[PDB]
Amino acid sequence: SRRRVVITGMGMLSPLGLDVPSSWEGILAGRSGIAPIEHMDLSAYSTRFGGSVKGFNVEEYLSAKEARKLDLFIQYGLAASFQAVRDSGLEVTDANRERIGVSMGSGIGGLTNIENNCRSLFEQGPRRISPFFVPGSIINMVSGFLSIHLGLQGPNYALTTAQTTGTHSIGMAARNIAYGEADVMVAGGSEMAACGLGLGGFGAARALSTRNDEPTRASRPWDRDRDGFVLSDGSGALVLEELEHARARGARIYAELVGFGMSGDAFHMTAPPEDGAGAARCMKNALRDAGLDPRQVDYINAHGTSTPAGDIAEIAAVKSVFGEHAHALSMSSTKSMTGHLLGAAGAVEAIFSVLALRDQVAPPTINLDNPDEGCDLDLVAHEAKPRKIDVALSNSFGFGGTNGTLVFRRFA
Amino acid sequence: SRRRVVITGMGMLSPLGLDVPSSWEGILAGRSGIAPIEHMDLSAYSTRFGGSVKGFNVEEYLSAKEARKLDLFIQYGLAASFQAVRDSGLEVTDANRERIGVSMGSGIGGLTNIENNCRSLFEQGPRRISPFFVPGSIINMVSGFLSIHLGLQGPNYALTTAQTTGTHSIGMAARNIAYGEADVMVAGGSEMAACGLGLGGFGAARALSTRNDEPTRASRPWDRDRDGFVLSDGSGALVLEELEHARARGARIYAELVGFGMSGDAFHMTAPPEDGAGAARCMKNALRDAGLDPRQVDYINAHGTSTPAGDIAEIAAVKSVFGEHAHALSMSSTKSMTGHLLGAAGAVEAIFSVLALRDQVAPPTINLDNPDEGCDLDLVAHEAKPRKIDVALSNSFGFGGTNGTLVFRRFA
Ligand SMILES: C[C@H](N)C(=O)Nc1cc(C(F)(F)F)n[nH]1
């Protein structure tokens, strides 16, 4: 048998806000966090906008000196992680520190730092590279710095599954607890890829929306005029906790994590199969893992990236899995508002799925002005929809055909 | 309930050879794979040598058309993966492809490609960034491309835990199989960090040996004249398989994976604690996972990086875990010959540990002329030691205080 896993703490930086409740208030108001990117010359670039974190103050978390050692994606991951641990109320002690671990990941990691050190190297040679270049840029340093700061001695690792990272991180941390390898895990992801290399790299693949004139309308999942994803920054962290451990200390429980699915498309490096066969297998695996019938699902937080092929693949996958129930559930893309946080997408979207359960409301897909051919599901166009939600899924489908699905259920 | 996991296939690129047998022949012969680096001009750098893969032919494995899109760390990881799958004898079918996954990780990933594209961006503009920059550089694309080429539809992910990556990848892939999430996993790691930013960044930390005038003697684990690690390139991959699945198809079984441990030091971003407390916690976790008496351990493939603090921490940890038995087991660092393959170190060293079991021989720690204060175990100085090996342990320790231990034993 397996132990039950609940969510007792959440933390976030997003284009909508510097914490969970501010972000969530924006989500339910249909607000966009997308704007032209500042303090960066994007003249030569085909995309000049994205989802930036606005007004982040790292000195609320770290000394200026410890912050100078760390790439922005690590700063953002630590901010979300500290928020989540605070929100959980957990007290770390010599009696439990070997049972508390971390799995905070990233899709792309320390591009900003790599960029800034390339500048030093090309202009002046290697002797100007920062001594902290390597430890301050590598993806496992959110887990690393968090464990050092809070004295966590439990499983310490980091996933990097591109746009699926935050979903896999949470799911695998839930397995650690379910199978008795930990009692508490801090899990999620962070990303800051708004650099020449990120906007330039995705731009060279022509993967991004180029709707420079109306950035807030760029991210329009399932709309017939969508023209690719919107690049966004931030972080999400959850405190996962074994149920008896949470009840023993009187934790506030937001929701239960009942299912995790993984699959590989084995199809293409960047594009999903048109029928979303891999996304369907992954959702079916997550529902089997939860012991739930597709008919019990009420709300899906889609991957919903605003790419032509990805959005239509998800509709096909949901129709395949859910059959006569596919129209009864609500499915929305919060990427319509936040843009695509890449490795942090699944982390912030797990939090939005948990809050959909808490508040009994489906967040909107904004900009869904003209649903495309066959996009005839309840996609919660334009405005939040209060409804019964007992079971919420969150899907991530990333480069390499790597899929993840989380299943959350109301706890009582 | 938890299933047993065996090793049925192995694959490798190392500084000693373009496959497993050639690498292992070098290991048992005490041969060094370390030499001045030829692929770039390092005259401005404090370290100008390392463990390169010599004469790698990507067209043994991939079309030159596909190879051109991929960073060397991806090409190396695919080469080792393909070798391991071929060595396993496994045939991928519609009946089993959903039950076969992949977890190939990296510590740093596509730093050469990112550097080269940063040079394009800075010198020429964003329009000269490769369209393949993201899928050809990000760490999950070994798992991704391997799944696409072989049709693996099982769990598809990647770890990035710095110098612990290969050990974590193999251990977690074993748990996937143990817990029923997959019947087969291809797991390991790959690394090619020998670019300006890699050698420059580890050089800026003063972490690397600077023995430029005698590179084969630079890597000298536990030697009083050691002065840091040697940077090395390559890949290890193993096919892990559920025992009854292997038995049912008449697989050749090299060894059984009986134990996996993780722990966090929670001490320092880069420095190991002198007392090796986290490494000891990790080994004890792994031995308890394997249901072993510590006296059963015959051979330890150490992390053995040739750093002052790391090498002595490992002696302290082994003495703390094994007590008087610390004097009966054999422990060696194959990094004395291969150098430090970073995220691939744990993968090649797991293969060396399995071959120690197959051949009943402890590989040497070459260059151990003058063991340092307290370094008074059997460290297999200079020459391979034939001996009884029923149980072999492979340790890895990384930045962020992240520790992993694998326990292998003979299978009859
Ligand atoms: C004393 C040390 N500077 C520290 O920050 N402790 C700390 C932070 C947190 C939380 F909840 F934010 F994660 N708990 N405990």
Distance from CA of A192 to the nearest CA of B (A): 14
Contact B131 A205 (CB under 8 A): yes
Distance from CA of B26 to the nearest CA of A (A): 31
- Which residue has tokens 């890895």? B396
Distance CA A149, CA A66 (A): 11
| Resolution expressed in Å | 1.5
Of A101, A126, A152, the CB nearest to B200: A126
Confirm or reject: Cβ of A85 under 6 Å from ligand 1.
yes
Of B115, B121, B160, the CB nearest to A158: B160
Contacts of A150 in chain B (CB under 8 A): 266
**Which amino acid is it at A43?**
S
The interaxial angle of helices A308-322 and A277-290, nearest 10 deg, is 40
Q: What is the DSSP string of B152-203?
A: --S-EE-B--GGGHHHHHHHHHHHHHHTTS-SEEEEEEEE---SHHHHHHHH
CB B370 within 8 A of CB B26: no
Confirm or reject: Cβ of A86 under 6 Å from ligand 1.
yes
Distance CA A76, CA A108 (A): 14
Q: Could you tell me what percentage of chain B is helix, strand and coil, using 3-state DSSP and rounding each to the nearest 5?
A: 40, 20, 40
Residue B193 CB-half CA count within 13 A: 31
The number of angstroms, rounded, from the C-alpha of B336 to the middle of its chain's C-alpha atoms is 14
CA of A157 to the centre of ligand 1 (A): 20
Instruction: Dig out the tokens for A76 from the structure.
Output: 């953002």
DSSP assigned state of A87: H
CB B226 within 8 A of CB B340: no
Q: How far is CA B378 from CA B375, B381, B383, in A?
A: 9, 8, 12
Instruction: Dig out the tokens for A165 from the structure.
Output: 């990272």
CA torsion angle for B294, B338, A133, A76 (degrees, to 10)?
-50
- Which residue has tokens 């996937």? B176
Contacts of B400 in chain A (CB under 8 A): 135, 138, 140-141, 143-145, 147-148, 156
Distance from CA of A367 to the nearest CA of B (A): 28
**Which amino acid is it at A87?**
D
Distance CA B33, CA A362 (A): 59
Q: Which of A59, A97, A150 to mutate to test the pocket of ligand 1 (most atoms within 8 A of CB)?
A: A150
CA of A82 to the centre of ligand 1 (A): 7
Is residue B74 within a helix (H) or strand (E), and if so which, with residue range?
A: helix B72-88
**Which amino acid is it at A199?**
L
CA torsion angle for B143, B147, B152, B154 (degrees, to 10)?
40
Contact B156 A262 (CB under 8 A): yes
Distance CA A156, CA B159 (A): 11
Q: What is the DSSP string of B309-363?
A: HHHHHHHHHHHHHHGGGGGTSEEE-THHHH-B-GGGHHHHHHHHHHHHHHHTEEP
Distance CA A250, CA A254 (A): 13
**Which amino acid is it at A192?**
M
User: What angle is formed at CA B179 by the lines to CA B174 and CA B185, rounded to 5 degrees?
Assistant: 35
Burial class (CB in 10 A: 0-12, 13-18, 19+), B166: buried
Atom of ligand 1 nearest to the CA of A83: 12
- E strand map for A170-329: 184-191, 234-242, 255-264, 299-301
Residues with Cβ within 8 Å of A118's Cβ and at least 6 positions away in sequence, in order, are: B115, B118, B119, B122, B197
Neighbours of B270 (CB within 10 A): 20
Between the two ends of chain A, the Cα-to-Cα distance in Å is 21
The neighbouring-strand residues paired with A398 are A402
CB B80 within 8 A of CB B350: no
Residues with Cβ within 8 Å of A229's Cβ and at least 6 positions away in sequence, in order, are: A202, A207, A208, A209, A219, A305, A306, A307, A335, A339, A340
Of A130, A140, A207, the CB nearest to B399: A140
CA of A86 to the centre of ligand 1 (A): 8
CA torsion angle for A48, A53, A55, A56 (degrees, to 10)?
-140
Between the two ends of chain B, the Cα-to-Cα distance in Å is 22
Nearest to B168 by CA among B393, B357, B343: B343
> Which chain A residue has the Cα nearest residue B280?
A153
Distance CA B256, CA B244 (A): 12
Confirm or reject: Cβ of A145 under 6 Å from ligand 1.
no
Task: Kindly provide the b/e burial profile for residues A77-110, where b requires at least 16 CB atoms within 10 angstroms of the residue's own CB.
Answer: bbbbbbbbbebbebebeeebbbbbbbbbbbbbbb
CB B299 within 8 A of CB B269: no
CB A318 within 8 A of CB A328: no
Contacts of B127 in chain A (CB under 8 A): 44, 204
Q: If DSSP codes are grouped into helix, strand and coil, which group holds residue A234?
A: strand
Residues with Cβ within 8 Å of A40's Cβ and at least 6 positions away in sequence, in order, are: A194
The neighbouring-strand residues paired with A261 are A405
- Optimal mutation site among B269, B285, B289, B307, interface A, most CBs of chain A within 10 A: B269
CB B39 within 8 A of CB B51: no
Distance CA A255, CA A359 (A): 11
Distance from CA of B108 to the nearest CA of A (A): 7
Nearest to A272 by CA among A402, A107, A108: A402
Distance CA A360, CA A350 (A): 15
φ, ψ of residue A41 to 5 degrees: the values are -85, 100
User: What angle is formed at CA A80 by the lines to CA A75 and CA A83, rounded to 5 degrees?
Assistant: 120
Longest C-alpha distance within chain B, in Å? 64
Radius of gyration of chain B (CA): 20
> Which chain A residue has the Cα nearest residue B198?
A134
Residues with Cβ within 8 Å of B301's Cβ and at least 6 positions away in sequence, in order, are: B331, B332, B333, B334, B349, B350, B352, B353, B356, B363, B392, B393, B394, B395
Distance CA B51, CA B72 (A): 14
**Which amino acid is it at A302?**
A
The 3-class secondary structure across B13-65, one letter per residue, is EECCECCHHHHHHHHHHCCCCCEECCCCCCCCCCCCEEECCCCCCHHHCCCHH
Q: Which of A86, A91, A102 to mutate to test the pocket of ligand 1 (most atoms within 8 A of CB)?
A: A86
Contact B161 A158 (CB under 8 A): yes
Contacts of A139 in chain B (CB under 8 A): 139, 160
Neighbours of B200 (CB within 10 A): 27
The neighbouring-strand residues paired with A191 are A234
Nearest to A268 by CA among B84, B141, B189: B141
Q: Which spans in A89-240 are helix H?
A: 111-124, 141-150, 165-178, 196-204
Distance CA B232, CA A306 (A): 41
Contacts of B135 in chain A (CB under 8 A): 205, 269-270, 399-400
The number of angstroms, rounded, from the C-alpha of B41 to the middle of its chain's C-alpha atoms is 27
Distance CA A198, CA A138 (A): 16
Strand bridging mode B184-191 / B100-105: parallel
CB A258 within 8 A of CB A240: no
CB B75 within 8 A of CB B56: yes
The number of angstroms, rounded, from the C-alpha of A249 to the middle of its chain's C-alpha atoms is 28
The neighbouring-strand residues paired with A190 are A235
Burial class (CB in 10 A: 0-12, 13-18, 19+), B285: buried
**Which amino acid is it at A154?**
G
The neighbouring-strand residues paired with B402 are B264, B398
CB A154 within 8 A of CB A182: yes
Contacts of A70 in chain B (CB under 8 A): none
Order of strands across the sheet that contains A100-105: A156-157, A100-105, A184-191, A234-242, A5-13, A255-264, A402-409, A391-398, A299-301, A330-332
Distance CA A231, CA A338 (A): 9
Method of structure determination: X-ray
